Amino acid sequence: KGVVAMLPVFYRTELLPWNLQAEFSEEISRRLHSSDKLLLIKHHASAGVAAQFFSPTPNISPELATQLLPAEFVVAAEILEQKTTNPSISASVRVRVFDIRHNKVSMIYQEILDASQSLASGSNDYHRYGWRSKNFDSTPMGLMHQRLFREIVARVEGYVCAN
Ligand code: NA
């Protein structure tokens, strides 16, 4: 199994009763944990150590990655946007994976993944049916999120295991 560290999800910016970054961090973390392809470590990386992996052009010395050891790979997912507009709700995430083996830091995967769902597909009462509630996964946002989280982890698994 590839040994991975997940950074808190990055989101640069509210009518939602929960924090989108917190949902995305937990839901991706739960799926990397459940993956039998990936061993998800617990780390305590500082704000600045995590943040460097989200710089558009990263510059990360080996010294600046040691807080993520003993992971071999660092998963850095950024929410670029979640928006509405057959009006729909959509979200876009930039996924990066870095290889931090061998006292080096290299970005081995970068891709923008996205998902969209018709707002008519279910209820948009995100206070009655918000994240964690039973029926969130039946709302347009929850359906969209579920597919996106599944794709994010499938891609991470593929690129980690390829390497
Ligand atoms: Na796992």
mmCIF file of all heavy atoms in Angstrom, residues 32-35 38-39, ligand 1:
data_model
loop_
_atom_site.group_PDB
_atom_site.id
_atom_site.type_symbol
_atom_site.label_atom_id
_atom_site.label_comp_id
_atom_site.label_asym_id
_atom_site.label_seq_id
_atom_site.Cartn_x
_atom_site.Cartn_y
_atom_site.Cartn_z
ATOM 1 N N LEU A 32 -10.032 7.747 1.673
ATOM 2 C CA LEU A 32 -8.645 7.299 1.613
ATOM 3 C C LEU A 32 -8.395 6.280 2.704
ATOM 4 O O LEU A 32 -7.666 5.299 2.497
ATOM 5 C CB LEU A 32 -7.705 8.492 1.751
ATOM 6 C CG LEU A 32 -7.763 9.555 0.662
ATOM 7 C CD1 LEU A 32 -6.870 10.741 1.063
ATOM 8 C CD2 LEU A 32 -7.292 8.987 -0.637
ATOM 9 N N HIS A 33 -9.026 6.483 3.869
ATOM 10 C CA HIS A 33 -8.959 5.506 4.960
ATOM 11 C C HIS A 33 -9.574 4.173 4.534
ATOM 12 O O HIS A 33 -8.952 3.112 4.667
ATOM 13 C CB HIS A 33 -9.670 6.088 6.194
ATOM 14 C CG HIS A 33 -9.707 5.180 7.369
ATOM 15 N ND1 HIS A 33 -10.705 5.233 8.309
ATOM 16 C CD2 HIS A 33 -8.886 4.175 7.745
ATOM 17 C CE1 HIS A 33 -10.496 4.304 9.223
ATOM 18 N NE2 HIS A 33 -9.402 3.643 8.899
ATOM 19 N N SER A 34 -10.779 4.217 3.957
ATOM 20 C CA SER A 34 -11.436 2.979 3.540
ATOM 21 C C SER A 34 -10.690 2.282 2.413
ATOM 22 O O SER A 34 -10.774 1.054 2.277
ATOM 23 C CB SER A 34 -12.869 3.273 3.108
ATOM 24 O OG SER A 34 -13.614 3.808 4.190
ATOM 25 N N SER A 35 -9.993 3.037 1.568
ATOM 26 C CA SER A 35 -9.246 2.405 0.490
ATOM 27 C C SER A 35 -8.280 1.365 1.037
ATOM 28 O O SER A 35 -7.473 1.647 1.927
ATOM 29 C CB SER A 35 -8.461 3.449 -0.307
ATOM 30 O OG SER A 35 -7.587 2.796 -1.226
ATOM 31 N N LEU A 38 -4.416 2.346 -0.081
ATOM 32 C CA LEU A 38 -3.710 3.499 0.464
ATOM 33 C C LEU A 38 -3.741 3.437 1.978
ATOM 34 O O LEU A 38 -4.787 3.151 2.567
ATOM 35 C CB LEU A 38 -4.349 4.810 -0.001
ATOM 36 C CG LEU A 38 -4.426 4.962 -1.524
ATOM 37 C CD1 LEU A 38 -5.190 6.256 -1.865
ATOM 38 C CD2 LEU A 38 -3.063 4.944 -2.198
ATOM 39 N N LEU A 39 -2.594 3.700 2.607
ATOM 40 C CA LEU A 39 -2.481 3.713 4.061
ATOM 41 C C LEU A 39 -2.422 5.169 4.502
ATOM 42 O O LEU A 39 -1.434 5.856 4.237
ATOM 43 C CB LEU A 39 -1.230 2.982 4.526
ATOM 44 C CG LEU A 39 -1.013 2.888 6.039
ATOM 45 C CD1 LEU A 39 -2.191 2.246 6.704
ATOM 46 C CD2 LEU A 39 0.251 2.081 6.346
HETATM 47 NA NA NA B 1 -6.796 3.182 3.433
#
